[PDB]
Design a protein around this ligand. Sequence first.
Ligand SMILES: Cn1c(=O)c2[nH]cnc2n(C)c1=O
Length: 129
Amino acid sequence: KVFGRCELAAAMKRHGLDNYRGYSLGNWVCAAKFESNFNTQATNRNTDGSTDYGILQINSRWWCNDGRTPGSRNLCNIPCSALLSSDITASVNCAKKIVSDGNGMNAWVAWRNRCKGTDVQAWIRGCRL
Ligand SMILES: Cn1c(=O)c2[nH]cnc2n(C)c1=O
């Protein structure tokens, strides 16, 4: 599923991401924009053999099981395929664990490089939320 900007903001708020760990909804929408272009089915293979899955490009080396990332963990206790669903529940629940791991949203390198410090409120501007 390719979400619209405000559609994804509303789904993220519905699932308790707005201001989760202090990160406003615009931060989450901005991260999703540059990680996946709002596409739940986005996947991207990393140099190390791990793979990033879903709207927030959650990585198989720590967070989900894809059966093909040697030495990895599955800390969200989910198959990585669950991160590709049109329903974003699994991605949101896992992202809550990631953002709580110590480094906040810096775990998403695209958030650090393209959202952090910017006018992230623009990402939810005009949305009925
Ligand atoms: C060492 N290490 C990490 O580097 C890491 N990165 C993300 N989760 C992590 N966990 C749980 C971890 O133990």
